[PDB]
Write a protein that binds this ligand. Structure first.
Ligand SMILES: Oc1ccc([C@@H]2Oc3cccc(O)c3[C@@H]3CCC[C@@H]32)cc1
Ligand SMILES: Oc1ccc([C@@H]2Oc3cccc(O)c3[C@@H]3CCC[C@@H]32)cc1
Lengths: 211, 233
């Protein structure tokens, strides 16, 4: 099981499961089409996340239905890091704030995504940390919304895996040369950003469902 | 000055700052819940002003943070006092409601279930009072930090301060866990478990806002009115 993997094995498995960066094939049309194609790759990526396939199909579907937008958004923010002021939806679709005003209700979300990307840049987020965070989102997002006996076991499994990913993040920070205090401070800084990603996803859904 | 406090002083400060538990007044379930939340807001501002470092910020930034986090703060408070009442939500000592009593208002039951699950999680983790106050302060400082308007030197200075205080609370959380006898690995694991729940609290607040808006002076001006006090008294 995933509970037996080592910190380096975890990082390795995660880096390998990384989906491909797709290209865009009016604006909403392009964003949703892109999202639709990425979803297919997300599902394959998910199954590769240590511990995911150990859950019931029903629960696998639940976690994905709950975390897909947060997962797409953290990916967007990650590839937009080296591009201050712009969101790299796709290599051939790099948009700025003004282009966001185009659609209604869209710029407010663009601004939050931009701010998040800036925070990651400021923190100098590493690719190893990024994959860990994305996996955390997948497992954490829908766990608080699955009282049956079967649920107990599922949740227990999820939490153990999450603990493993936490150890991995800490491990990465240790090898990076951070002091213990710096380590736990960065761990918290990174997890607190997940709350903002949840927020952006909620708003993204409000914007999506509003049309 | 808040950045020089020790872990123990940080904890004592937060504990001392705790707001009072209000009673429901008296039925319109929403009327009761909203009136209760309205009266608690007044006390929330007093509590916020007592959170180390909060008053060093500008009035504008203080209002923005509270406008962003008020419902999360009310909800974590609710979940906290509901910990000893499995299956029920203790909105107030005289307003303990169960799941079915939530079906009396469309779209309320889904939120109730989320709050109830959060309460069970806290109970399952044996959340400590010292940890609860640290978490509530983190919500206050973190929820709206990523949505600050300007990027002026002043703004950059405020964000630096907020992140510095947040690091301090993180230090305090780890200190509490260390004194509890947990190993370093258990400390890091619990810290993560606690912070991930804030993601769920953020989620509930958003669903709560959507619900509140389904049943519509702007909140900002109301918070500003109360935060912008004079010194004649
Ligand atoms: O990889 C990605 C990441 C984000 C997007 C897009 O992000 C945004 C951002 C702002 C407003 C939106 O409606 C969307 C839509 C809503 C669904 C997602 C899609 C598309 C592809
Ligand atoms: O201390 C507290 C905590 C929560 C509440 C109530 O919590 C809920 C829960 C579910 C649906 C709601 O509309 C509310 C309303 C929306 C505003 C808050 C209020 C009231 C007082």
């Amino acid at each position: 099981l995933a509970l037996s993997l080592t910190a380096d094995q975890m990082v390795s498995a995660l880096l390998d499961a990384e989906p491909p960066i797709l290209y865009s094939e009016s604006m909403m049309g392009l964003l949703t089409n892109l999202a639709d194609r990425e979803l297919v790759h997300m599902i394959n990526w998910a199954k590769r996340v240590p511990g995911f396939v150990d859950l019931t199909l029903h629960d696998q579907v639940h976690l994905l239905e709950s975390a897909w937008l947060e997962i797409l958004m953290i990916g967007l923010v990650w590839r937009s890091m080296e591009h201050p002021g712009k969101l790299l939806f796709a290599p051939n679709l790099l948009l700025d704030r003004n282009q966001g005003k185009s659609v209604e209700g869209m710029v407010e979300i663009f601004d939050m995504l931009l701010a998040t990307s800036s925070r990651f840049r400021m923190m100098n987020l590493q690719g190893e940390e990024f994959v860990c965070l994305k996996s955390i989102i997948l497992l954490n997002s829908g766990v608080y919304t699955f009282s049956t006996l079967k649920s107990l076991e599922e949740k227990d499994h999820i939490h153990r895996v999450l603990d493993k990913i936490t150890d991995t993040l800490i491990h990465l920070m240790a090898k990076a040369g951070l002091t213990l205090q710096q380590q736990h401070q960065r761990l918290a800084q990174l997890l607190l950003i997940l709350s903002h990603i949840r927020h952006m996803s909620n708003k993204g859904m409000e914007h999506l469902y509003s049309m």
